[PDB]
PDB file of C-alpha atoms in Angstrom:
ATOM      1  CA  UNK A   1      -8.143  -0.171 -19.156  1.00 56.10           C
ATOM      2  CA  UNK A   2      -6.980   0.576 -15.217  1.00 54.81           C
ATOM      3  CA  UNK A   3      -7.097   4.146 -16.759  1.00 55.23           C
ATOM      4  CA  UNK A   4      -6.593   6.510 -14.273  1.00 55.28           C
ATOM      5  CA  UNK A   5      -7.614   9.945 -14.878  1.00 54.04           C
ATOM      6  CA  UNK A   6      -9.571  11.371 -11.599  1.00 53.27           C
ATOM      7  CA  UNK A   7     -10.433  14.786 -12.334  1.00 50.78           C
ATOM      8  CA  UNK A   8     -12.780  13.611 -14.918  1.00 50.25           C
ATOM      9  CA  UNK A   9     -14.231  11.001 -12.717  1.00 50.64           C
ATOM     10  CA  UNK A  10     -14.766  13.986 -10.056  1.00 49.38           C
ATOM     11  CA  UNK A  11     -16.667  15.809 -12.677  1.00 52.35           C
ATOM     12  CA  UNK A  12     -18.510  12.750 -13.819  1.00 49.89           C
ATOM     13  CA  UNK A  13     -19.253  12.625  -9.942  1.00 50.13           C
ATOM     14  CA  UNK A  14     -20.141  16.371  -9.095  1.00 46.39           C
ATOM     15  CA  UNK A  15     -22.566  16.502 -11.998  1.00 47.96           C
ATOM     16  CA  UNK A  16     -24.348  12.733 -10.453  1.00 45.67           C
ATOM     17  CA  UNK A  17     -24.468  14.728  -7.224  1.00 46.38           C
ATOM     18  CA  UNK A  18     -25.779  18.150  -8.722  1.00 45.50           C
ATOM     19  CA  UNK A  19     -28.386  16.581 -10.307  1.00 44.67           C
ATOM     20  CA  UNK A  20     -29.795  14.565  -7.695  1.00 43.90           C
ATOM     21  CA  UNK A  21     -29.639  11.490  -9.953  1.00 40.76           C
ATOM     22  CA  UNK A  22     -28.701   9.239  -6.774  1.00 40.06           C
ATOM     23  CA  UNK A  23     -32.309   9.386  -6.024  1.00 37.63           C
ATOM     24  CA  UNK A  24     -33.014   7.669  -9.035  1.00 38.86           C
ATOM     25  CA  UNK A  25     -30.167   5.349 -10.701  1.00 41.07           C
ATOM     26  CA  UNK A  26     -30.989   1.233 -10.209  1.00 38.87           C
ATOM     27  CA  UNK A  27     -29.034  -0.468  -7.032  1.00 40.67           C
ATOM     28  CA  UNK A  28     -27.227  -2.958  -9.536  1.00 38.86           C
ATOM     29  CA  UNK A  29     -25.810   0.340 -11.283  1.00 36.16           C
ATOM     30  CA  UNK A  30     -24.842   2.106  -7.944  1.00 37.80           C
ATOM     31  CA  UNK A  31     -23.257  -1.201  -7.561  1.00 37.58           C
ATOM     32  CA  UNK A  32     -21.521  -1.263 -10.775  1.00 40.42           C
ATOM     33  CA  UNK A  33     -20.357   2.424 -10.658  1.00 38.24           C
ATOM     34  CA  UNK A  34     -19.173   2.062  -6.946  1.00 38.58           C
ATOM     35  CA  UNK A  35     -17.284  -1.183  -8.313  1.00 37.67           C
ATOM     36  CA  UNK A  36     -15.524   0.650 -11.209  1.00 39.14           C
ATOM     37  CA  UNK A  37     -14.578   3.383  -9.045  1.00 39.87           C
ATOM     38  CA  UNK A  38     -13.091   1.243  -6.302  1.00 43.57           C
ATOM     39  CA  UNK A  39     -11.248  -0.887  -9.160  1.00 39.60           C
ATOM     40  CA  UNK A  40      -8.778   2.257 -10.003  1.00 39.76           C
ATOM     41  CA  UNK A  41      -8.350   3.282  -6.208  1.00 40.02           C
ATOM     42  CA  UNK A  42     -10.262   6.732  -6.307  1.00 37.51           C
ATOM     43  CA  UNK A  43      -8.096   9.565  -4.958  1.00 37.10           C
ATOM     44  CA  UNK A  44     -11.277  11.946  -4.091  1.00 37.90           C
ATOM     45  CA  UNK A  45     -13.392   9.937  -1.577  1.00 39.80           C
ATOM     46  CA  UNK A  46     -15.365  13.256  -0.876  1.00 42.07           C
ATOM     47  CA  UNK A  47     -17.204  13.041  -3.985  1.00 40.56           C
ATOM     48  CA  UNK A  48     -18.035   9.326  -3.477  1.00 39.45           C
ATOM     49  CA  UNK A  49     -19.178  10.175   0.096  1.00 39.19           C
ATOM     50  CA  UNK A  50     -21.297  12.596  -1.072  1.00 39.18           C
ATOM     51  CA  UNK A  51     -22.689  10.501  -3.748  1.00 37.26           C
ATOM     52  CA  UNK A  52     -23.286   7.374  -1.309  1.00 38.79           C
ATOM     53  CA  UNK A  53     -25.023   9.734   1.559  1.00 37.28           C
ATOM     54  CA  UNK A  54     -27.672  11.101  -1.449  1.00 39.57           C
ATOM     55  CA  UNK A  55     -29.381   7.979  -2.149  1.00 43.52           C
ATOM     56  CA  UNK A  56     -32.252   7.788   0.283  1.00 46.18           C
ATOM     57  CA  UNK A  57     -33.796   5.390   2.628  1.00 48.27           C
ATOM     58  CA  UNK A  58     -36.323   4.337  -0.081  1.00 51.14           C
ATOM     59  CA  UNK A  59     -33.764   2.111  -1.992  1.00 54.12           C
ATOM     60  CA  UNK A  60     -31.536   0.479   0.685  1.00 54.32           C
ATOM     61  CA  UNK A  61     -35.143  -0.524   2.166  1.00 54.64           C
ATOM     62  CA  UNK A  62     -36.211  -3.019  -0.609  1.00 52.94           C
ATOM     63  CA  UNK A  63     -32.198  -3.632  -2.357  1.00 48.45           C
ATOM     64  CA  UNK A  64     -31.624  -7.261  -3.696  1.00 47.26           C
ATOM     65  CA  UNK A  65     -29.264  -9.603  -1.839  1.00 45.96           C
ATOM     66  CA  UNK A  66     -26.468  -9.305  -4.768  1.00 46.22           C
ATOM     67  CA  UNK A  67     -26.319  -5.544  -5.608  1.00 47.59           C
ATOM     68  CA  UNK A  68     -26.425  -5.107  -2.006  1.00 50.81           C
ATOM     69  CA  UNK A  69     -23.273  -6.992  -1.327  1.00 49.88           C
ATOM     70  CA  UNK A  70     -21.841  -5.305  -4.350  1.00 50.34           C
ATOM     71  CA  UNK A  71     -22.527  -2.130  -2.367  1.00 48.07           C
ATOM     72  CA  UNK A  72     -20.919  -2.693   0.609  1.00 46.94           C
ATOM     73  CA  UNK A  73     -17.811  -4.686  -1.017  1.00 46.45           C
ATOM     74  CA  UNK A  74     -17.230  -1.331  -3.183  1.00 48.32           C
ATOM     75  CA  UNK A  75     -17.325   0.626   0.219  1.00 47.88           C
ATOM     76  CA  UNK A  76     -14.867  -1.391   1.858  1.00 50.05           C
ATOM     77  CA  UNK A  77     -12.393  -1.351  -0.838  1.00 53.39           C
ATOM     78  CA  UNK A  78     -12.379   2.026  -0.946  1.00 53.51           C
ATOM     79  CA  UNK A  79     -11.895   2.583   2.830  1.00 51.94           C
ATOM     80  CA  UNK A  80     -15.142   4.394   3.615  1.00 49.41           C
ATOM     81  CA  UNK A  81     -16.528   4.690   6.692  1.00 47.66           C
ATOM     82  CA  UNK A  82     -20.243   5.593   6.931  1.00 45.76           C
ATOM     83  CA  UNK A  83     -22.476   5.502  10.557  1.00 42.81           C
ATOM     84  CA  UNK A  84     -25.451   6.080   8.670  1.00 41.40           C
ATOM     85  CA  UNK A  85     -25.204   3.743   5.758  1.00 41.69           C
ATOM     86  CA  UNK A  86     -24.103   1.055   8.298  1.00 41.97           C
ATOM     87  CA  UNK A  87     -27.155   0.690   9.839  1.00 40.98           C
ATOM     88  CA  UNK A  88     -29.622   0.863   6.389  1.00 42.71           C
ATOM     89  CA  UNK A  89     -26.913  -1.858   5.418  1.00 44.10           C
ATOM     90  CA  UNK A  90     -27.535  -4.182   8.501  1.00 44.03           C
ATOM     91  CA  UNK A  91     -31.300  -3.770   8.356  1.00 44.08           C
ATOM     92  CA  UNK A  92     -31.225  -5.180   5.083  1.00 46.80           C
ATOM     93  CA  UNK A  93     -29.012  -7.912   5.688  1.00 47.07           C
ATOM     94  CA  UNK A  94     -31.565  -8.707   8.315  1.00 48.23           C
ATOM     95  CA  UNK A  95     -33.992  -8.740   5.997  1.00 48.24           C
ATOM     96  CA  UNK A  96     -32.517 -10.728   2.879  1.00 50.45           C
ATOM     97  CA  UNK A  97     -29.534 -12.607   4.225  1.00 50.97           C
ATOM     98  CA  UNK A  98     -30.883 -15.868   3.547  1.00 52.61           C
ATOM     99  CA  UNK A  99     -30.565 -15.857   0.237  1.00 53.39           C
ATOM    100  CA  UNK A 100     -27.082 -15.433  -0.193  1.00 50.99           C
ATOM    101  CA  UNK A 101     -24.983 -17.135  -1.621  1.00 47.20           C
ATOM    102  CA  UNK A 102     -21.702 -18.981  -0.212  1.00 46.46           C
ATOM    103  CA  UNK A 103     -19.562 -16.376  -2.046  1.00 44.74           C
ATOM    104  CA  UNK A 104     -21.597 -13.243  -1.355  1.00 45.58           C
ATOM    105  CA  UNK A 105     -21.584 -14.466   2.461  1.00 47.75           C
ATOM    106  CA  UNK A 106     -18.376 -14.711   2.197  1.00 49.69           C
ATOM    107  CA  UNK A 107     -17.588 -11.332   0.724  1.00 51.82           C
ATOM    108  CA  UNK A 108     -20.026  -9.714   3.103  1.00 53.08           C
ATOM    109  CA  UNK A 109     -18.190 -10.869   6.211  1.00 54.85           C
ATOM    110  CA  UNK A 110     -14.838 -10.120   4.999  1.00 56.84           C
ATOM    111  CA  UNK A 111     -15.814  -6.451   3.749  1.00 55.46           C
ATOM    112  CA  UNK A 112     -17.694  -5.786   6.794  1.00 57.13           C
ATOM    113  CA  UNK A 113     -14.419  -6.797   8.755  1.00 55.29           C
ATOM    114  CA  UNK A 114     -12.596  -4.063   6.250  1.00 56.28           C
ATOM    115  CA  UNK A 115     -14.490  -1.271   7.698  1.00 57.25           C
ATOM    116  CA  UNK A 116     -14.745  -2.286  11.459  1.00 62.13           C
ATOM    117  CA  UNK A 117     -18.373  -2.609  11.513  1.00 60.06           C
ATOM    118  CA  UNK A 118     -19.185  -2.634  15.121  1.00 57.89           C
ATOM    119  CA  UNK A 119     -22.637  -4.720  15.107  1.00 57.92           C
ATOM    120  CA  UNK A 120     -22.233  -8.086  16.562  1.00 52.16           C
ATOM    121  CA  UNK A 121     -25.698  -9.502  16.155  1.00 52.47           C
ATOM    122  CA  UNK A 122     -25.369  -8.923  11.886  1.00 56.23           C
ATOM    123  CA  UNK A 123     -22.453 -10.724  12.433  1.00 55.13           C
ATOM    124  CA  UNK A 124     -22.741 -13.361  14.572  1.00 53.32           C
ATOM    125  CA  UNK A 125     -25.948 -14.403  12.701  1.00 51.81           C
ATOM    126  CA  UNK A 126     -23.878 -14.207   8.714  1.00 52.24           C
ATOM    127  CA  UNK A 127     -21.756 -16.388  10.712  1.00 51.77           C
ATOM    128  CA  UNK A 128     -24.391 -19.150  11.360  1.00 51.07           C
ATOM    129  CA  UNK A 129     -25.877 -19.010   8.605  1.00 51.72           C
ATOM    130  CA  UNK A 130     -22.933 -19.423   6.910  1.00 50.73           C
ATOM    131  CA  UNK A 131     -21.842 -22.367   9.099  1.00 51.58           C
ATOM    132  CA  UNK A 132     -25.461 -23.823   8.455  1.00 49.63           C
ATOM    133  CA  UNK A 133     -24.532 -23.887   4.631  1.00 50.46           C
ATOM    134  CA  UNK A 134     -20.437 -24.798   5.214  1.00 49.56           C
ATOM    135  CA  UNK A 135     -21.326 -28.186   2.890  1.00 49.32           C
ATOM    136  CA  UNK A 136     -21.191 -26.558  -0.289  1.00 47.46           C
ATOM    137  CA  UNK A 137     -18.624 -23.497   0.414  1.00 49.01           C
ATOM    138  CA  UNK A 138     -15.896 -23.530  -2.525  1.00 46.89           C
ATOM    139  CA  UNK A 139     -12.007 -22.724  -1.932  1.00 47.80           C
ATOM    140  CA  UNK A 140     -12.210 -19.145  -3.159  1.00 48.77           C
ATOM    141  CA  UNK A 141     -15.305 -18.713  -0.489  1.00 46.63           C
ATOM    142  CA  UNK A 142     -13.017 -20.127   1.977  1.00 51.15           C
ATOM    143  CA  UNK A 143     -10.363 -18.306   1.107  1.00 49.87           C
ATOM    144  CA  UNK A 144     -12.147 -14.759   1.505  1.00 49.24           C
ATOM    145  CA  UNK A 145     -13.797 -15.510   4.998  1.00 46.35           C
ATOM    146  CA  UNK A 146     -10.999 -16.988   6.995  1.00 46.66           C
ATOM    147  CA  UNK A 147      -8.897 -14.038   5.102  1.00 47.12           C
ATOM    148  CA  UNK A 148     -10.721 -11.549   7.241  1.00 46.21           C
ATOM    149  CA  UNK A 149      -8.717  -8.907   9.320  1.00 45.99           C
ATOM    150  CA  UNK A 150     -10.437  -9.819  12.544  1.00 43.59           C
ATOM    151  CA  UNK A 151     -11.523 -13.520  11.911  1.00 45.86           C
ATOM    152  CA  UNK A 152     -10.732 -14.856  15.579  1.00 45.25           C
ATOM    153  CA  UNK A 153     -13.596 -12.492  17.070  1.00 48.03           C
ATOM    154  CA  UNK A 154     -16.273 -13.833  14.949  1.00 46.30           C
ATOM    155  CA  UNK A 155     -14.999 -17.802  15.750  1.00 46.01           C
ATOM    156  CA  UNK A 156     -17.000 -17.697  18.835  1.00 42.86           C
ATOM    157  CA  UNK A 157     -19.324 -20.526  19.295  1.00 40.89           C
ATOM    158  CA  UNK A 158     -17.961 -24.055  18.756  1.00 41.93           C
ATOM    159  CA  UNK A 159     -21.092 -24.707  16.977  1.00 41.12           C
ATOM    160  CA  UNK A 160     -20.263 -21.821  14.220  1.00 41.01           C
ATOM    161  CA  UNK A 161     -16.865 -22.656  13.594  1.00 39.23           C
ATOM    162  CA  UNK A 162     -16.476 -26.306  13.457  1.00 40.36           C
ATOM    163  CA  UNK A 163     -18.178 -27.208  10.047  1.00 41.22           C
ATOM    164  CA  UNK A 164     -15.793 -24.250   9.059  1.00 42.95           C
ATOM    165  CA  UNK A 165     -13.022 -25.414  10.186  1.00 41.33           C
ATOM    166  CA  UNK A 166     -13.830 -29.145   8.768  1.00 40.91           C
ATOM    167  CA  UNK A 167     -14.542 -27.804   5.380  1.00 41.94           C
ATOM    168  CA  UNK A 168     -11.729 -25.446   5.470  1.00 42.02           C
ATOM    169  CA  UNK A 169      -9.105 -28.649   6.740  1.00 42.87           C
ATOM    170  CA  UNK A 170     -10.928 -30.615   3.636  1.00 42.35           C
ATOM    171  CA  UNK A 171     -10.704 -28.257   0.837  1.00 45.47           C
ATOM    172  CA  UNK A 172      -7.963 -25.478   1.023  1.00 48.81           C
ATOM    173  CA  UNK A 173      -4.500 -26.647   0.162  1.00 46.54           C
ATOM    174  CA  UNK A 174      -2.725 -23.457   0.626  1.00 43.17           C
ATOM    175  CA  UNK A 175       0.095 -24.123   3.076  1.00 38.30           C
ATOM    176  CA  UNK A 176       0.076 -19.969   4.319  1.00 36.84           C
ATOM    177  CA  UNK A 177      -3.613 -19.974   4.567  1.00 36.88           C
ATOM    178  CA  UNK A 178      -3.617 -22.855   7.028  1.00 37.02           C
ATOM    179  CA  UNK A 179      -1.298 -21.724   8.979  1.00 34.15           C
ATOM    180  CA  UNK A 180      -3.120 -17.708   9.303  1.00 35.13           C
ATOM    181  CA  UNK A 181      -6.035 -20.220  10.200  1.00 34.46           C
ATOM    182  CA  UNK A 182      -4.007 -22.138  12.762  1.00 32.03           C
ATOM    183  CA  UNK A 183      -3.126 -18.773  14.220  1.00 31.87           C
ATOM    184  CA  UNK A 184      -6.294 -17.674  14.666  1.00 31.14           C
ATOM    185  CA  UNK A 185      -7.580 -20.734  16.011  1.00 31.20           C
ATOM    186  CA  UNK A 186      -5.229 -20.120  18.602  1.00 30.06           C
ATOM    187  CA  UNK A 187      -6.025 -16.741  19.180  1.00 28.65           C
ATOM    188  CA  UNK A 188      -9.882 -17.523  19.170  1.00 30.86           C
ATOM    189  CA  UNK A 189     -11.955 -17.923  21.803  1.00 31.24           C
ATOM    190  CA  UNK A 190     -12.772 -21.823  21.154  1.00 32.00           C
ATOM    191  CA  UNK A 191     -12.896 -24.849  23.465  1.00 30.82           C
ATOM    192  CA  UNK A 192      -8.944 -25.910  23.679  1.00 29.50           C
ATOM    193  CA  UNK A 193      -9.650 -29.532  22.412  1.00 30.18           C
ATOM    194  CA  UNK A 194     -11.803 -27.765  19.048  1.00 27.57           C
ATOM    195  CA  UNK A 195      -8.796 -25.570  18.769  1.00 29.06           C
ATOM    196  CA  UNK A 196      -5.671 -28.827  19.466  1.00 28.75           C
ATOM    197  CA  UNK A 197      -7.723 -30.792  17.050  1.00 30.52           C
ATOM    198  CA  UNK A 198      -8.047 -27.871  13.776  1.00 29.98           C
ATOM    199  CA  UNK A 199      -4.269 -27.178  14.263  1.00 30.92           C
ATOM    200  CA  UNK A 200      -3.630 -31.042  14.022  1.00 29.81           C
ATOM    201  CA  UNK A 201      -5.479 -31.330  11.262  1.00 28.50           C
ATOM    202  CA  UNK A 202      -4.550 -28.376   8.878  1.00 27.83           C
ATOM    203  CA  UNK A 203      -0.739 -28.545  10.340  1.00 31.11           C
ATOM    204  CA  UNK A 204       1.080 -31.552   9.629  1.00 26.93           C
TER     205      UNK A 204
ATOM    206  CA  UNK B  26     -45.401 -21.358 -29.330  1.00 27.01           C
ATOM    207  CA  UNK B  27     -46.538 -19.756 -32.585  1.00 26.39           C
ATOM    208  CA  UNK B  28     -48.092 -17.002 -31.552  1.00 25.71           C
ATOM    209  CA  UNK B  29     -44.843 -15.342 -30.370  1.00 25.23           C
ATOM    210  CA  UNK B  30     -43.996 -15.615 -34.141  1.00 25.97           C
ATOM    211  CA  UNK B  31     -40.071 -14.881 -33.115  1.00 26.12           C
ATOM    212  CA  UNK B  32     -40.964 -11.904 -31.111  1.00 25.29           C
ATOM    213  CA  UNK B  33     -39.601 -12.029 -28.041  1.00 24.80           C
ATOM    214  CA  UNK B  34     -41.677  -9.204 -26.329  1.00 26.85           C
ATOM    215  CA  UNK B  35     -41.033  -7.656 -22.943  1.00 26.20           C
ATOM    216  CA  UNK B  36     -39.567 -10.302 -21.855  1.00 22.39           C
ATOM    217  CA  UNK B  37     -36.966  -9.983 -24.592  1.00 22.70           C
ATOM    218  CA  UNK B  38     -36.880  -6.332 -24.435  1.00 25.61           C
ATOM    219  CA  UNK B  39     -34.701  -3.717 -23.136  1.00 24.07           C
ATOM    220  CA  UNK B  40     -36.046  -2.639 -20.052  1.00 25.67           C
ATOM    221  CA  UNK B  41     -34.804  -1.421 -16.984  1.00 29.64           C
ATOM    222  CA  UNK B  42     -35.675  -4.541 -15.094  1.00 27.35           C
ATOM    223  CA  UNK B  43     -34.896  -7.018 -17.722  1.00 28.14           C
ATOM    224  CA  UNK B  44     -31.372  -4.777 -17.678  1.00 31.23           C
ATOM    225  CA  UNK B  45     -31.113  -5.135 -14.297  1.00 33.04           C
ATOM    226  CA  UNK B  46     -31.070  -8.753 -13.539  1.00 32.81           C
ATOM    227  CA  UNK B  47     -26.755  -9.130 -14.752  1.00 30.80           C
ATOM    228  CA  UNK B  48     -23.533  -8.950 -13.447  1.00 30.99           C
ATOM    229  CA  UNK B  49     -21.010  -8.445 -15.760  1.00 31.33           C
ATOM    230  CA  UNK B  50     -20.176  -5.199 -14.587  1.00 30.03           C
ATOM    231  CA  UNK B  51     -20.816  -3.539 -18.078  1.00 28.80           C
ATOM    232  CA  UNK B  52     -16.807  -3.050 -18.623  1.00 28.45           C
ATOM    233  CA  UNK B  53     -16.652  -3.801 -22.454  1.00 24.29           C
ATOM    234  CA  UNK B  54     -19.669  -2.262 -23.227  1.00 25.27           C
ATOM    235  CA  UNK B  55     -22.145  -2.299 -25.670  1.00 25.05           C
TER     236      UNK B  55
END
């Protein structure tokens, strides 16, 4: 209903904290709640702070691939910044990022990007294997990685960032997209020829 | 399979883990 009432949200959240029910609720339903508060913009990130540091170690350790990424997206829309939950985050990326899909690799990089995550290695690897998979990457997948805030830094490696670029050139048909990707092609770090080529190709 | 005789079981049921295994984000709700 994009209803937006947030003192009762606030007391739906105290009472979840009070209780010590983070300890407890399913990762697809921290997922879902996060979501549904990050869909109205939440005014009292506090609460939801509070409510995200609960949870314990126990249930990032063994979290499926999807809630996971659910997690993490609902964090970045709602502009939290967490050192802690960072780092159970990347661990478990470590552990389960090959099975995910194009969309929730996708969604991963470009939330991660939201919040500034420092690691490089989490990245950098999302990025291959992403690359590895670029054949069957849709528009909207496309459309949400080479969207990110910071998208030059992770086109290192020629190797990472040419079946991108190829499948990007191939499928999107947005004429302001390609031209943010031109951009950052020329901002990247890339070999010059990689970089002449892409803008040919998606300008023109 | 007879047996079943049109009962799906746990598999059918409403557990947590057979609850857990959607994404529809439970907006309309049930």
């Amino acid at each position: 209903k994009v209803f937006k009432q947030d003192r009762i949200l606030k007391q739906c959240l105290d009472y979840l904290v009070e209780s010590n029910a983070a300890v407890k609720l399913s990762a697809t339903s921290i997922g879902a709640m996060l979501n549904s508060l990050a869909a109205i913009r939440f005014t009292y990130h506090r609460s939801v702070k509070q409510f995200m540091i609960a949870i314990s170690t126990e249930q990032w350790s063994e979290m499926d691939a999807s809630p996971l990424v659910k997690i993490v997206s609902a964090m970045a829309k709602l502009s939290l910044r967490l050192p802690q939950v960072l780092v159970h985050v990347g661990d478990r990326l470590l552990d389960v990022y090959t099975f995910l899909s194009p969309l929730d690799t996708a969604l991963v990089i470009n939330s991660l990007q939201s919040i500034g995550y420092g690691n490089d290695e989490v990245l950098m690897m999302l990025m291959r294997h992403a690359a590895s998979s670029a054949r069957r990457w849709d528009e909207v997948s496309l459309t949400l990685l080479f969207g990110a805030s910071g998208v030059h830094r992770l086109l290192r490696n020629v190797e990472v960032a040419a079946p991108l670029l190829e499948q990007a050139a191939g499928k999107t048909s947005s004429p302001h997209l390609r031209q943010r990707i031109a951009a950052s092609l020329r901002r990247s770090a890339l070999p010059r020829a990689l970089v002449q080529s892409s803008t040919s190709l998606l300008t023109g | 399979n007879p047996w079943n005789d049109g009962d799906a079981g746990w598999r059918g049921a409403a557990t947590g883990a057979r609850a857990n295994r959607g994404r529809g984000g439970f907006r309309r709700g049930r």
